[PDB]
């Protein structure tokens, strides 16, 4: 079996294990910020922000055809501070190709280039999106399954308890083909849930790299914070 | 769309929606006692008892073949007071034929007969065992997936926070067929997951009942408490 695994109980400045790109950057606190906390404390409009582990995973082997299943886990929180206008944009996680570079941000979250479907992406994620754009259901925050396109294939509504730490756990189950996610706000109690059939082998290269994503806005305080706590990621492919 | 739903925030001696059977109460604290709890305040060993609500539900129709999709949740606690022996057997959400009567106690949850399967059970349901027999996997307590069997076709274990309330969220969507569990401990934040893929239309009679069961063990003090403080459900069969 070829497994791989982490965690980041809080994160440290300087450590081996993570690339950042754009905006993104850790605090001596601990936290991981995706998107530019400015001077004040308050979340800066039009941010980008993405961290990478730095070792690829392997999710399916080209060879015999095993197909790995994985499990991750992080906490986040989401602060919408301004009372004018709309909040933006949400924070997803994301396996893709290795080797990745920011795409476009706003309703894009990072990840993908425009708002049509494209094999070519090779590229999962599970989005914790805040703001109802033109492909997006009307109800947000909601959390989406993401396969090739930033339009999800299914989502769930879900309630913002704003500037709280929520729990996420995603796990791929091969077997099944099943992708499950869970959002958990201890502070309220809240608890939702989220499914759907994702065919891996057919849908990502046979390496990738696992990350997380947040963006801000495009205009003037269509902001809020994408702050991450902690991040923990196992994954098992049957030899 | 035909829909069916009910919520108990609170359990009521009295109420019209439930029917009671074997051991299973309602404490005028409004706590659903599956398993007979004795005069000193603990629970006694072989008990099986089941609450059943009063309406059938429509799962899929015979002559469209449109399936329902269903959502339950449900708060339950399990204390295991004795050192010895141990603690058994566990509780149970059941979906199976109409007019449904307790089945074997002990390991068999109230709702099977024996440990074979058997397509006649027309029963699926989800467990929280807490005793491993002949046919369970080693770590209890476990979630378990079962398909007209008491031999999970998926299992997750999950340490008992011993006495704590713990949360249940239950999905199944019948366009992806995946039957989505879990559960969450908010006195630990702990958190589980499993999921596996169920066909309805071929596990499940068209309509069905719904309900909770819950036993204690086949020796002295081999027994637990298997309270339910809460229980809504909705399903939704498109038309
Ligand atoms: C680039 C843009 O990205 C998505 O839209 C973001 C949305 O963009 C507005 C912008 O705020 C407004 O000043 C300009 O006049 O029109 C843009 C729409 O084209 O701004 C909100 C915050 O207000 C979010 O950041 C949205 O993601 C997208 O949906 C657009 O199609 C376009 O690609
Ligand atoms: C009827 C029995 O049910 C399951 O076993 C339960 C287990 O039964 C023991 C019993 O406690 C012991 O006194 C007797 O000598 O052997 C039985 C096993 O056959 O007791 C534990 C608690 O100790 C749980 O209640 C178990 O569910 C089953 O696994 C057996 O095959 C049998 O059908
Ligand atoms: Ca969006
Ligand atoms: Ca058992
Ligand atoms: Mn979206
Ligand atoms: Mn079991």
Redesign the interface.
Known sequence: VETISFSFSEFEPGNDNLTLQGAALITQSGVLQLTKINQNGMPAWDSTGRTLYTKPVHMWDSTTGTVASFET?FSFSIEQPYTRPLPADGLVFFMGPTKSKPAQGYGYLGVFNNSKQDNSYQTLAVEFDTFSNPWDPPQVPHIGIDVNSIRSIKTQPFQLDNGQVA?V?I?Y?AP?K?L?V?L?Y?SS?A?Y?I???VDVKQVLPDWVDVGLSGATGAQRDAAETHDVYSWSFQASLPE
């Open positions: 886990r729990n756990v796990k189950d099944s099943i499950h869970v958990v201890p109690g608890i849930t499914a759907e059939i």
